């Protein structure tokens, strides 16, 4: 039951940050599947290995955990978001409050009239740091 707290801890640590300065994300992702294919790891561990992948790909590689706003402020829905998820002290279905610290940080260009633009952004860097998964 320490393994259950160190697999999910890793998958929270890394959500769509990829090979930028932590190449370990292919090493741990392998390890999230290592212990689903096995029938030699305890259910109370497997349960924390499924979410290790389930939050990683959360939202389609779009949402991330960040308790305060990039503006700068600790907004409450996120704080509670990861405070009542981690908590399984006695209750097991507390595993949805992680949709309130999920934010799809993306530039949302909105036109002067509160409508939809068409406009794009130069690459100042290669698509490897841009990233986003590879379906195989």
């Amino acid at each position: 039951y320490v393994r259950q707290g160190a697999l999910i801890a890793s998958a929270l640590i890394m959500i769509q940050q990829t090979e930028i300065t932590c190449p370990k994300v292919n090493q741990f992702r392998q390890l999230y599947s290592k212990v689903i294919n096995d029938k030699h790891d305890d259910v109370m561990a497997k349960f924390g290995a499924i979410l290790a992948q389930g939050i990683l790909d959360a939202g389609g590689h779009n949402v991330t955990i960040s308790l305060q706003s990039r503006t700068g402020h600790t907004h409450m829905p996120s704080v509670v978001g990861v405070l009542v998820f981690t908590q399984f002290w006695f209750w097991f279905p507390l595993s949805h409050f992680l949709s309130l610290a999920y934010t799809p940080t993306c530039v949302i260009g909105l036109n002067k009239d509160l409508k939809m633009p068409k406009v794009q952004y130069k690459s100042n860097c290669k698509p490897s740091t841009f990233a986003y998964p590879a379906p195989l």
Binding site: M76, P77, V80, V84, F90, W91, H96, S99, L100
Partner: protein
């Protein structure tokens, strides 16, 4: 969670497991219905706070007030609204296993970020009497 983002059409998507249109069958999917509705309308509860208040007020099953407290606390989260704080307060003065757990959490959510110094000396004192690993 999967359909967080639907507003006026969410009552219809969840209308095939929510009470009234659905049989009292497995109160699990009714309580789960209400909880889900508090997930979709979390922090923005408008008409949904009233809907959930009519679902808890006339509730007679323990599972319905479980998931129901979980939906209602989310829809009126960060607010004050003294009506829902005292309804959820009656859930806790009723002393029933799984209704008082979710109801306790839901009352902490209704008064989130505030809490009257009276609500504290209410809740801690009621924690001295009670006896449970879930409600307490």
């Amino acid at each position: 969670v999967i359909h967080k983002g639907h507003e006026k059409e969410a009552l219809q998507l969840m209308a095939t497991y929510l009470p009234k249109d659905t049989s009292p069958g497995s109160a699990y999917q009714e309580g789960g219905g209400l909880y889900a509705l508090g997930l979709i309308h979390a922090n923005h509860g408008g008409d949904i706070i009233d809907y959930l208040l009519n679902q808890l007020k006339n509730a007679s099953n323990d599972i319905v007030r479980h998931g129901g407290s979980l939906g209602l606390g989310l829809a009126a989260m960060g607010t004050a609204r003294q009506d829902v704080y005292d309804l959820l307060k009656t859930n806790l003065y009723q002393d029933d296993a799984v209704t008082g757990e979710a109801a306790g959490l839901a009352l902490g959510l209704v008064m989130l970020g505030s809490k009257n110094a009276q609500a504290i000396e209410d809740m801690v004192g009621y924690a001295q009497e009670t006896q449970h690993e879930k409600i307490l």
